[PDB]
Symmetry: C3
Subunit: 271 residues, 3 copies
């Protein structure tokens, strides 16, 4: 259980998007990946650099109403204002009542709750979302982590036929965090790969009856994640991921998981 | 288990609504909570007090076609009529061939199947829905149970910005039953609390790999439930629950889980 | 693990439809059920008999990009062309990193990826879909398997009020494969029966905490399956299955699981 501190800034981007960043003028969409171990406390020294009220609200983690990031709990930030948000986490364990307390561990996310509406509809639309992973002791750690956000009809707020693409090598342990926002349900599909429908996205062993899937229905504020061995049993290639709702996939919102051979090459593809 | 008998009434209510009740003029939307233990049998002496055919149909439980509650199986109820429905439940166990028979236990629900359409579209819209809990031997029992129904764009058929709110004290074991009906998908979200995506909404112990969530996609006739310790690790507070579909949350369709300190107070909220 | 070889054909059908068949002129919607055991390899000698490009794309199974069935990987089929697709499967096992590799076993599906659009919107709409089951050693095998596809507002591309109905006898072990396609989310409900939300749709034992359900939200390209003992604890009957989205159920998009007594009768 470390007590940890980061700085976070909400910025309006040149293009009129809105992003979180770890430093001024370094905002990204999605926002920076926050990673904590169960038991860790994080203090986020947040600065709203924008000319509108903005906030930081987190799913899954332990927070008091004063870190709700809502108008209801007097927890949003005035233009140019500052606020320290506090996120706590806990390990699982036996309560006195003999019950098992579930831990914080999982694939989570943070987003604005007051831009445009008192539910953050405008901030979320403009890019104020990012991933949070809470790890349990012993969890398997990846070679890389990639965050895919279905935000209305967009992926990571990109234009149609502009990715995002993620590169790996065959055999790499690659982690995906998959977050949904906005108005629409979606189905997330990845070619050539599959994962478990459980906390880690990985089967614990032969006694784990979790469905193994390559396609998952998601709605606004859903988060899940998984890890794959890149190209396992399928080889190097351009492995598309996309929404499987037919009108959505036809808008040209598709990304590629580019799995290269150890010589840096990939079977030829036509994007 | 035990053999149980109850009366149930379907009644027209104010503002063109329809509800189930355990007594005449005590109909509620949602309808009364029905709670059974695996193995129990329930006989429901159902009176349709309305001027249109109505029925009772249940998810999850054991029932014969004579208690289907459908026109197909001639088990709806004529206006002003009475019919006894029978719900059975069973415990899990190995079959003779060594497969495992799943038990009845879970978060379930009952609704009308013949008002407006032969799928109960009018009856459900107007409020003919309620919760059923079937418990397993050794299940953890709560201090209170609250039912939240996303019915089209309404919560429990309340208009925009009309709660419902649920009160607890820090430390209470609070059960939620979450049912969806109608036309739309939703995502159910609760601030400051989380649960397991499994039968009871609680992890069985360290071998249970179920995802821990605070947001769940649901569609018409989905039911799930869970228990939380009120304010566990987060303290007293006005803890919002709402649909996270942004247009739905922006219509005011929000309620509060009001978690008080033992001294009866709650951190100031607006 | 066996190496298996089949032929498949894509063909235009009546009423503006398209389907897959094991023989020319024998295409069905849904397409033929393909059943494999973990470790089996299947080579599909696919002939596109149509006047438009078409492909075969599979969920869940092991395939190389040369069997992706996509424009991106140039592995669709010209009109009148033939292509051998290869699907591999694997058993689960312990990896050299100490993790458990998930096996191929599950309820899966295949469909076109290039008719109408580069995502197969037109091919899927018109009937180019079918079920795939991959079994694990020791899995419980059914007496009968039935495939239900929610494709847009249709079931198995049947018109409103067109079933399909499935017949069983009380005590039969009946498997359902449930696949969704198109534009819409659905909720699949079956009267009188329930299943586990897990890989097999059956609880493995008392240590399996999976929710037991009779209603499941599904979206495009979702697949799940389950087995039930027909009429278990409920008896013979006409047992409705339907989408539970109310306007969907109201269109006539409903079928029956017709469970007979041992003497052949159904409560009428
Ligand atoms: Cu909120
Ligand atoms: Cu989509
Ligand atoms: Cu795909
Ligand atoms: Cu695919
Ligand atoms: Cu949120
Ligand atoms: Cu090229
Ligand atoms: Cu029904
Ligand atoms: Cu909603
Ligand atoms: Cu929240
Ligand atoms: Cu129902
Ligand atoms: Cu695809
Ligand atoms: Cu439907
Ligand atoms: Cu039903
Ligand atoms: Cu697909």
């Amino acid at each position: 259980g470390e007590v940890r501190r980061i700085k976070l800034y909400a910025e309006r981007l040149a293009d009129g998007q809105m992003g979180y960043g770890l430093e001024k003028g370094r905002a990204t969409i999605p926002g920076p990946l926050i990673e904590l171990n169960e038991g860790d406390t994080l203090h986020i020294e947040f600065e709203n650099t924008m000319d509108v009220r903005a906030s930081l609200h987190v799913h899954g983690l332990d927070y008091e109403v004063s870190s709700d990031g809502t108008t209801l709990n007097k927890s949003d930030v005035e233009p140019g204002g500052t606020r320290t948000y506090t996120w706590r986490t806990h390990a699982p364990g036996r309560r006195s009542d003999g019950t098992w307390r579930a831990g914080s561990a999982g694939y989570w996310h943070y987003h604005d709750h007051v831009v445009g509406t008192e539910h953050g509809t405008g901030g979320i639309r403009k890019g104020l979302y990012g991933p949070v992973i809470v790890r349990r002791k012993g969890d398997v750690l990846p070679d890389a982590t990639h965050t895919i956000v279905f935000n209305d009809m967009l992926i990571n707020n990109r234009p149609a036929h502009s990715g995002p693409n993620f590169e790996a090598t065959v055999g790499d342990r690659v982690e995906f965090v998959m977050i949904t926002h906005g108005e629409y349900y979606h189905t997330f599909h990845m070619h050539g790969h599959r994962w478990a429908d459980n906390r880690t996205g990985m089967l614990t062993g032969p006694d784990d009856p979790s469905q193994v899937v390559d396609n998952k229905i998601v709605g606004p504020a859903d988060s899940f994640g998984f890890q794959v061995i890149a190209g396992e049993g399928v080889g190097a290639g351009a492995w598309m991921y996309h929404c499987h709702v037919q009108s959505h996939s036809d808008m040209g919102f598709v990304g590629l998981f580019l799995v290269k051979k150890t010589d840096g090459t990939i079977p030829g593809y036509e994007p």
